[PDB]
């Protein structure tokens, strides 16, 4: 996250870190046994890390649980990033309390102008590189479909939305991918892509979660 703030330990209790020896992507806990992340975060050997603040220090609220199964969206296209969503089942159920909690799925999509909270352990610089140990946060609005498509001609599908600031300086970034965009207590987006980070006229592009709730529920129901 570029231009954000330190969330506070365990203030974002649905935020997970995906670990393959190191943090590589974010995710969101949507029930005791399932995580949603980006399909471009897929790899084998994932350990899900719940209850994290400092990803490099054991602070006492962690749960580390191996993935038993990963499911990339049937129609994921890694060239266009259309349908950039995946589900991860945990080998055992997480213990849910105030510091580790699931986030509600939307019953309704979000509109332009709604404020949202975006979080992760991604790069904090837009020129150059600095990866934080503790979770970083950004409050950002959803942008209109038209300003999204104007920023990124021929690249925005009905499964994508823009959020952030066209002026630059405040965005998600590398390492935040797969993590949450939560608006009025609902998981509305997944950190997906963008040209650079926090660049003028190049806002963040997010997977539109409300399009996927049917798929998510039926997948959980049968796995
Ligand atoms: Ca830790």
Curated annotation (Swiss-Prot):
Ca(2+) binds at residues 52, 54, 57, 62. Residues 1-221 form the Peptidase S1 domain. Keywords: Calcium, Digestion, Disulfide bond, Hydrolase, Metal-binding, Protease, Secreted, Serine protease, Signal, Zymogen. It is found in: Secreted, Extracellular space. The keyword NAD does not apply. The active site is at 40 (charge relay system), 84 (charge relay system), 177 (charge relay system). GO terms for molecular function: endopeptidase activity; metal ion binding; serine-type endopeptidase activity; serpin family protein binding. Belongs to the peptidase S1 family. This is Serine protease 1. The lineage of its organism: Eukaryota, Metazoa, Chordata, Craniata, Vertebrata.
């Amino acid at each position: 996250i570029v231009g954000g703030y330190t969330c506070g330990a365990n203030t974002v209790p649905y935020q997970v870190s995906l670990n393959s020896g190191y943090h590589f992507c974010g995710g969101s806990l949507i029930n005791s046994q399932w995580v949603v992340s980006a399909a471009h975060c897929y790899k084998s050997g994932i350990q899900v890390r719940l209850g994290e603040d400092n990803i490099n220090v054991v602070e006492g609220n962690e749960q580390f649980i191996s993935a038993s199964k990963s499911i990339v969206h049937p129609s994921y296209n890694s060239n266009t990033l259309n349908n950039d969503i995946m589900l991860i089942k945990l080998k055992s159920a997480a213990s849910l309390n105030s510091r580790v909690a699931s986030i509600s799925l939307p019953t309704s999509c979000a509109s332009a102008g709604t404020q949202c909270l975006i979080s992760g352990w991604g790069n904090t610089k837009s020129s150059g590189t600095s990866y934080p140990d503790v979770l970083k946060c950004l409050k950002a609005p959803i942008l209109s479909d038209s300003s999204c498509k104007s920023a990124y001609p021929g690249q925005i599908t009905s499964n994508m939305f823009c959020a952030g600031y066209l002026e630059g300086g405040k965005d998600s970034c590398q390492g935040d991918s797969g993590g949450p965009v939560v608006c009025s207590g609902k998981l509305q987006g997944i950190v997906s892509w963008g040209s650079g980070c926090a660049q003028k006229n190049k806002p963040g592009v997010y997977t539109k979660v409300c399009n996927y709730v049917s798929w998510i529920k039926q997948t959980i129901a049968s796995n």
